[PDB]
Amino acid sequence: GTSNRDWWPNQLDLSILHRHSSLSDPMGKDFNYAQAFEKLDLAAVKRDLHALMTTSQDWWPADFGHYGGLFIRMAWHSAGTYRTADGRGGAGEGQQRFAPLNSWPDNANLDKARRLLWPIKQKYGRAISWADLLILTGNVALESMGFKTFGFAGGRADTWEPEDVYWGSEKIWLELSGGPNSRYSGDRQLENPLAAVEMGLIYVNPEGPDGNPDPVAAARDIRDTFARMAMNDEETVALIAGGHTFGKTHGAGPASNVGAEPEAAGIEAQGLGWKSAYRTGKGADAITSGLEVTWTTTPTQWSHNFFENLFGYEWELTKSPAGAHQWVAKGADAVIPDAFDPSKKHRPTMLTTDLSLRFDPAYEKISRRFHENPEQFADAFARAWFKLTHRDMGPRARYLGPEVPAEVLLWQDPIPAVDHPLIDAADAAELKAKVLASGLTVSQLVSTAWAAASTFRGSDKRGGANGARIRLAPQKDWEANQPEQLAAVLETLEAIRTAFNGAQRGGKQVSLADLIVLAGCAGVEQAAKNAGHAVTVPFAPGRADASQEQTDVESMAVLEPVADGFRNYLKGKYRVPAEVLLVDKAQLLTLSAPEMTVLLGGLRVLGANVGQSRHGVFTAREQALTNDFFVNLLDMGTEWKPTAADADVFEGRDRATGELKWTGTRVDLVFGSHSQLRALAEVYGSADAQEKFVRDFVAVWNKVMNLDRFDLA
Amino acid sequence: GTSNRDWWPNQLDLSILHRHSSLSDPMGKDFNYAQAFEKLDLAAVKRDLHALMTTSQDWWPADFGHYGGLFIRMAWHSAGTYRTADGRGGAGEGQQRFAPLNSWPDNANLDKARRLLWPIKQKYGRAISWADLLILTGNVALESMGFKTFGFAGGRADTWEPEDVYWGSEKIWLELSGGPNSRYSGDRQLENPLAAVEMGLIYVNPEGPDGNPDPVAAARDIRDTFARMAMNDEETVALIAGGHTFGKTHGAGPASNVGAEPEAAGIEAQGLGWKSAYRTGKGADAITSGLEVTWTTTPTQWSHNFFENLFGYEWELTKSPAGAHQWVAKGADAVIPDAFDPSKKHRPTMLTTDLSLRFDPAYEKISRRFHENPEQFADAFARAWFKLTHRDMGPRARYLGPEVPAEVLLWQDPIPAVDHPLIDAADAAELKAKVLASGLTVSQLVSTAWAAASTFRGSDKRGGANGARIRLAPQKDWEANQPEQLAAVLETLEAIRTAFNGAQRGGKQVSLADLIVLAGCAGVEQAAKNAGHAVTVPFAPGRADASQEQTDVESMAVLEPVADGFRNYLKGKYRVPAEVLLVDKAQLLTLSAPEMTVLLGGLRVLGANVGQSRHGVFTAREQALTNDFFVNLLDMGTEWKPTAADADVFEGRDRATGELKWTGTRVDLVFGSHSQLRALAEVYGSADAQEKFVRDFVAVWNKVMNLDRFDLA
């Protein structure tokens, strides 16, 4: 079937905005996973998981009699797709069980691990999501083997279709760098938003960079990819050495014996893949990565033997049975157990990337400290494991169940508890009135609240207006946020806040986070009044103010909007057209195409644009809430041409006279060009639409204001 | 950006089942277009449309001062994509305004026509859909030019994204036959379900078949394509000669002057395309098809001049200014007006396909009759125009407004009015009890009601259980319907109906159509009781019984299921895998993926399979309504292998013993293979799911039973 994507491969793709519809969801409209989980007997699940670790199935027999290593690998890969640059990937949606992740080469034989979990999934049904179960299983594996974890939170609801993620442009699995779709340029600079060195890997190549087995150069790739997954040097060392305390790799024979990945396998495979023709195809004969390394003398028990071996031996380069580069301690005795034959023992082996921990100078210092102080190693690993597996779960308010750690961690962007009565409706009306009486304009109000609320991204549920981090470094100095205008608004709102709070009885006070939002609501209400319409914008108090000391400035950098079509803002020049970056931002904001369309056209006429640019301001009543953007954008009396100065700026002129009416960017004019977006613009630009426009604008404005309010979930 | 389709181009595509979600729809959940239209002042709209016809806009100046030709073409293109094989295409969704139809080469410059209608669309907003407006505008054009139409019905709700239709496999627009993706094979046999001779055409090539200007061989293509669009010879001659009474073609210069189609055009084109560098690029200089023909002496007025010219001259082959083959009248005077210069006149011209109407023997007889009896021509053209533009609208119950023709037409598959009191709840309970007492089995009951209801297709809203057409030719004889078993069920139900009806007072009676569905409900109820569950299946009376004379047997043939996965039925061998045909049927039934999943797994255990096949009957309690299909399908204790005899049949054996447990087809096993369908199967196969399965099964069963119930809409 030839499709639209075939005829018009560069048209904008809206389908990413209508994924996750109620149509694809098997659960009822009212199903609430947190309610279900909260009644799960979690202790019972963990007991069944503990029994499972040592109950070998003949179709994928357990190494050493214990599946714990396999399950730790499964849970680390579930979490290990995460990229800080956009928040996408991670364990939070259980996406390892969908394409393409289920079939990535680095996820080979994790289809077996997931299948081992079906009996338990089936037993507990909807009360434990696959997403939660993958992580819980890795915790239970660690615990069964003697390792004390830092805790566990439930609350990852299942999803029902693949997410749309840019994983790279390569068309070949595992393509080495330098090809026609290379993700590298310059001096080994990996393109944003990617966080892996090759298509279909989690982070790095275990043999070394593009297969070159140099521990020192491998360490460069480790550091860069782990940083792109939000982990620093100490977390990276602790995670790699911790994970490789357990289990083993699989490379018993040549990789050519391994068949089709799950998405390519025959229907009789029933969702499994990588069927191998090497001997029995499993167990002693397993082939997964092609490497054949067992790190420690007790692969089913927590120990400090990884570092004992790494530092205690001198290493030499060798080849696995599948021909991959790996390292062996030739002076060692045969002290490592065989996974299936109690009469065999093996010498210590390591991957190139394990030796990175010793031969990179900065990693060596850390590894040495963990070697000498294994209690420090255990604590670091427990903390990093928790971070790894929860990094995309959002605010602590989403965390469910009896094992949530009480310690509040800086990475969580924590929000202080609220310990005082909240403003009520009358108080909100009084504050709206004071804000409007202060002289702050509709534009200032709308822009400030937008700036605060629109850092949210649903990919990892970071950002949003809770915390009032807009007043802190680095958000207060972001170019998009108009730092000097922003400072003047915040000073005025802070004086209003101080006056109101000082006049109260009995502990009632308003947060600046809440007042910034409410003030935005007042601006929207005044804009509707300017247009002749009385509306009330809904407002939910309860946000709290975070301190600068509770705010990791470097972690906050990835939230900076460098492209924000809702404010007609582009920080620099990008390869990707601005309209594509608008849809990407809409997706992060969890907006449908209709919601994107209404929100943009209202923001334009409210004066939300950065720098007060006239681009897309297609109204002669700026700061009134009307459908003017749509009516003027769709007026065929106006003809549009790119300017000589800038091909991405357009002049709209009267078709009969030539007089200049408007200017616009690609983001403005896409609404008049794309056949689906123009059909939406039409609805809002019709003569019957004034009420609908205002209603829908208020609804989406309020949705954006509440994106991080999991305390009301 | 590499996607799943790139890695796994053959994996089954479910996205077609989640199109048209509430996410992509700008209107509220509760918007009811029928109610909006019913309040529209249709007469006011028609007045504005009449004024438009001669209000020429300088960006696309009106030929002869009158847009009527352009608009008739527009409306006939809107309706002209329709295929009887699947009911897809047609005017009923307003898909002309979306990709790919907006950019088909045969729809060149209809972007201009649609833009001329924006001011009227805008004025009346949601109360007139684009879909309705395109057809209305064609009617008004006819009326403005002196032709009285047969009528008009509103009610075509707008859609908000492209439909997924198979339009062919060619990768080149207008590719001639015999290429790598040829839609032809054999003795010019066009592949089902296609109804056009080339990719991007409505029906045929106006120069002739593959560009060869032979009117006789063009006639063969016209007859075949028009038959695939539900039109016979008389309707075809009436439509072509009727349409070509008006207007003109556009080919003033070489086609290389025309640039990008709308989906490929720059953003500044604002939704238009085909911009031409030939002289002014419009009006007297327009280029659309490349042909330059004006048919009649009065192109803006209804006349009998088409047939006067066709028969009154001999025709000579010639070339347009763009190089296309066309015909000119030998020896004629310059009697045809120029569209823009009152001092110029031109000789009569014709397309190859117009000369088909004279040189094909069967068409010549009809054309001669219309030539001698122009009142017969006018009435046939009115009737065919109405059919053309309403053929995909469904039952008469959907038709809205004050211009709906009262005459009931055979093509509408008409249902007689109900003129008597309906059965009530007590009576329904009495009939269900009589059905269960008769000895009919759960399997017979469920199979019969499935067979009757599952002929519905949402593409053209034909089919369904209303009418009791299952008892008439040809449905009673369809292989899928198990004609001999069907006849024994219908005999028993007809005896029950006669006895019930005979015992009533006061005119109350039950139709056989209702009893077939009620009886299916009884079977589902009994199945639930067999499983130990108390269930009540909803039932809405009011279907009536159609007669054989109200049932066009040839038109009914395209509704025959040759593949019905829900009955594990495949009539023969097809190129397309059975699972792909299952998703196609689910799409015609308007089902989501979850609904398709639950319905199939219930049907399997209820005994709905054709021929009582054991394929997919994964239960030891056949005719009990349980989730057994899912629990047994997902049992990893069972291993699946294709049989030696047939690669599309599989054996499921106990993995440890080798004993045979089950057999299944691809339709059955795709639910344990495809990663999205497997995730749905898992929900229904969990230990907490028996009640959800029953409740979701009853809901989808009832949905299918009511698909054609537009009298309750």
Ligand code: HEM
């Ligand atoms: C530089 C980072 C990493 C590299 C290149 C890497 C590479 C690999 C490879 C190639 C295997 C063998 C796959 C097989 O053949 O079965 C694997 C196994 C494993 N990895 Fe990693 N790893 C990395 C980091 C991690 C981390 C962060 C963890 C967990 C905290 C993890 C835990 C494990 C475990 C437990 C296994 C054993 C699997 C089994 O027993 O079946 N690794 N690693």
Ligand code: HEM
């Ligand atoms: C064999 C079937 C048909 C063929 C091959 C065909 C071919 C064409 C072509 C090539 C044009 C010229 C496009 C352009 O250059 O502007 C056209 C114009 C037109 N056709 Fe057809 N036609 C067919 C049937 C129909 C039917 C069924 C109708 C309506 C009932 C129709 C009504 C018109 C009208 C009104 C125009 C004039 C457009 C204008 O004035 O701008 N034709 N036809």
Ligand SMILES: [Cl-]
């Ligand atoms: Cl994701």
Ligand SMILES: [Cl-]
């Ligand atoms: Cl369609």
Ligand code: NA
């Ligand atoms: Na994420």
Ligand code: NA
């Ligand atoms: Na259709």
